[PDB]
Design an enzyme around this catalytic site. Structure first.
Site, PDB file in Angstrom:
ATOM      1  N   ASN B  79      -1.234   4.691   4.518  1.00  0.00           N
ATOM      2  CA  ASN B  79      -0.565   3.491   4.068  1.00  0.00           C
ATOM      3  C   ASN B  79       0.133   3.683   2.738  1.00  0.00           C
ATOM      4  O   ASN B  79       0.429   2.693   2.056  1.00  0.00           O
ATOM      5  CB  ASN B  79      -1.564   2.340   4.009  1.00  0.00           C
ATOM      6  CG  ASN B  79      -2.272   2.123   5.355  1.00  0.00           C
ATOM      7  OD1 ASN B  79      -3.453   2.455   5.479  1.00  0.00           O
ATOM      8  ND2 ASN B  79      -1.562   1.638   6.361  1.00  0.00           N
ATOM      9  N   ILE B  86       2.573   1.480  -1.849  1.00  0.00           N
ATOM     10  CA  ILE B  86       1.507   1.019  -1.015  1.00  0.00           C
ATOM     11  C   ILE B  86       2.067  -0.022   0.011  1.00  0.00           C
ATOM     12  O   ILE B  86       2.709  -1.014  -0.352  1.00  0.00           O
ATOM     13  CB  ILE B  86       0.373   0.409  -1.830  1.00  0.00           C
ATOM     14  CG1 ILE B  86      -0.244   1.486  -2.730  1.00  0.00           C
ATOM     15  CG2 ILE B  86      -0.686  -0.220  -0.893  1.00  0.00           C
ATOM     16  CD1 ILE B  86      -1.143   0.921  -3.789  1.00  0.00           C
ATOM     17  N   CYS B  87       1.794   0.240   1.282  1.00  0.00           N
ATOM     18  CA  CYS B  87       2.236  -0.598   2.393  1.00  0.00           C
ATOM     19  C   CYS B  87       2.114  -2.089   2.118  1.00  0.00           C
ATOM     20  O   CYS B  87       1.036  -2.640   1.964  1.00  0.00           O
ATOM     21  CB  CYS B  87       1.417  -0.197   3.603  1.00  0.00           C
ATOM     22  SG  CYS B  87       2.024  -0.688   5.189  1.00  0.00           S
ATOM     23  N   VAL B  88       3.259  -2.757   2.146  1.00  0.00           N
ATOM     24  CA  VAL B  88       3.340  -4.155   1.773  1.00  0.00           C
ATOM     25  C   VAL B  88       2.699  -5.044   2.851  1.00  0.00           C
ATOM     26  O   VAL B  88       2.092  -6.027   2.546  1.00  0.00           O
ATOM     27  CB  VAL B  88       4.778  -4.635   1.567  1.00  0.00           C
ATOM     28  CG1 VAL B  88       5.436  -3.927   0.411  1.00  0.00           C
ATOM     29  CG2 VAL B  88       5.569  -4.476   2.848  1.00  0.00           C
TER      30      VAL B  88
END
Ligand code: NA
Ligand code: NA
Ligand code: NA
Lengths: 151, 148
Positions: B79, B86-88
């Site tokens: 992620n 960092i993956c929203v």
């Protein structure tokens, strides 16, 4: 109890520490009569469908602990991809990267974090896993409603 | 942004005085919209023993939206993108505007334990975690040895 004596002493030390200085949102309620049957509560974390609920669970320390992880059950009913129909927590949850240096504090953190981030690739609750992956807000609605009743 | 400054101050004070386990915040009064943090890689993960530097960027629309997060420590994680982002979508899950920095930091720490490869920004780490877990873990541990 069925644990080597020095393992019983390590478990006693750890549980007594967790009672005196509990991790955030976690409480342990040891029974000195049998330290291999541990009652725990985990607060459902904010920012998850379990927010606001108190999740009673049990850890069972088998004879090979800590070479093997304990078995874990949710006693509070929960809608969670990795929690089976009898409340059992999926064994891969704790087996992943498990080593014999790990203990109860690690188990409890791993389970608390699982409430934030399920692993639906290995879902024991296939309905919850599919909803999380495919219609997240519907997974969340179902988990919230069950938390309202049971948490 | 005035509102951001006000909101970050109250919560940052508590997080410095009473930090969550494994997490430390390093506020800079000059600009509270850019917040440096460290997270200890949890035991029982490929990140164990590492110290992970990260920052949060609090936009003007915080707390209606989550802050943007970056890992500053290099990491092999489904992620986390090529630039550390960092993956929203993960931080958005169940996000509401009553939430703050503490929730974000706990969410990121717990992501180190349980990645969500279904939405992998790092396609290789996501595929390896799902299809070759030991290779994922090996790659992540080796990078933690260098960078953590
Ligand atoms: Na999340
Ligand atoms: Na893990
Ligand atoms: Na996950």
């Amino acid at each position: 109890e069925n644990l080597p004596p020095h393992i019983i002493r390590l478990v006693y030390k750890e549980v007594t520490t967790l009672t005196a200085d509990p991790p955030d949102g976690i409480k342990v309620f040891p029974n000195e009569e049998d330290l291999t049957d541990l009652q725990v509560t985990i607060e459902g974390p904010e920012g998850t469908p379990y927010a606001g609920g108190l999740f009673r669970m049990k850890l069972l320390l088998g004879k090979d602990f800590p070479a093997s992880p304990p078995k874990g059950y949710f006693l509070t009913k929960i809608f969670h991809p990795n929690v089976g129909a009898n409340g059992e927590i999926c064994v891969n949850v704790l087996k992943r990267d498990w080593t014999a240096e790990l203990g109860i504090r690690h188990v409890l953190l791993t389970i608390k974090c699982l409430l934030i981030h399920p692993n639906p690739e290995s879902a024991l609750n296939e309905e919850a896993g599919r909803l999380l992956l495919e219609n997240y807000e519907e997974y969340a609605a179902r988990a919230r409603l069950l938390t309202e009743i049971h948490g």
